[PDB]
Amino acid sequence: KALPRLKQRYREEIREALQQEFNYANVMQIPGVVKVVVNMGVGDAARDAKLINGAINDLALITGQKPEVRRARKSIAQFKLREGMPIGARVTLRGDRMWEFLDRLISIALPRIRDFRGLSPKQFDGTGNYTFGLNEQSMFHEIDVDSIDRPRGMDITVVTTATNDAEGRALLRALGFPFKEN
RNA sequence: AGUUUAACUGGGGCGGUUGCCUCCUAAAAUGUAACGGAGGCGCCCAAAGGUUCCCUCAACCUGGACGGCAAUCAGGUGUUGA
């Protein structure tokens, strides 16, 4: 029909490749990309919550979704933080938007960041769910670079049905993630 | 000039206290004294009430850019210690 590039590639070849690398007794034990979450934790919004709107605009122009403004769970004296205030913009991404954002990320943004010597393959939680982070936003072409007054990084996590870092790493590298060899 | 100027009080005075709520004392019903042991109240909320629906934390582990023990994100453990 009109499936995303990455998704048709996934269910055409990557599933079989993962089966070969890990002979799974059941097809439903195959790893799959559940979701990707883009956090934009901005703790600098406590003193002034005017940076959160820029975080929102950035995440929207990146992913395609209005983010969820994560109110603080707790007040912290050191971080100048009360409860309930806007610290962080989260976007959950599932399905077609997820696959499209991953293709965009891989094929555009990661080679667009300065001095891209790869992403660490050790950055797995222990359940085949990856998480890396960025220090800025201009790596996404969707943003007008002239309109970037403040750098605003993020934490991108890719959570999968994999049950270990090995299968997760296989899946991500098959999708085409830049895992440097260390 | 007429009068008032409290009481409890291990004598009285000084000090402290005086009403309400919670615990212990209190002896497994209730209740139970002491200038016995500890605290709190003299409000707040127009939602912090009503109802319908939904959810389940804290803590810990692991991974994560600033981010640090601890901000927000992900996964897991977690039947309750929040």
From Swiss-Prot:
Signal peptide stretch: none
A GO biological process held by the record: translation
GO MF term list: rRNA binding; structural constituent of ribosome; tRNA binding
Organism superkingdom: Bacteria
Reported function: This is one of the proteins that bind and probably mediate the attachment of the 5S RNA into the large ribosomal subunit, where it forms part of the central protuberance. In the 70S ribosome it contacts protein S13 of the 30S subunit (bridge B1b), connecting the 2 subunits; this bridge is implicated in subunit movement. Contacts the P site tRNA; the 5S rRNA and some of its associated proteins might help stabilize positioning of ribosome-bound tRNAs.
UniProt-listed InterPro entries: Ribosomal_uL5, Ribosomal_uL5_bac-type, Ribosomal_uL5_C, Ribosomal_uL5_dom_sf, Ribosomal_uL5_N
Family label: Belongs to the universal ribosomal protein uL5 family.
SUPFAM superfamilies: RL5-like (SSF55282)
Protein source organism: Mycolicibacterium smegmatis (strain ATCC 700084 / mc(2)155)
GO cellular component, one term: ribosome
Keywords from the UniProt entry: Ribonucleoprotein, Ribosomal protein, RNA-binding, rRNA-binding, tRNA-binding
Subunit structure: Part of the 50S ribosomal subunit; part of the 5S rRNA/L5/L18/L25 subcomplex. Contacts the 5S rRNA and the P site tRNA. Forms a bridge to the 30S subunit in the 70S ribosome.
Protein's recorded name: Large ribosomal subunit protein uL5
Keyword Transmembrane: no
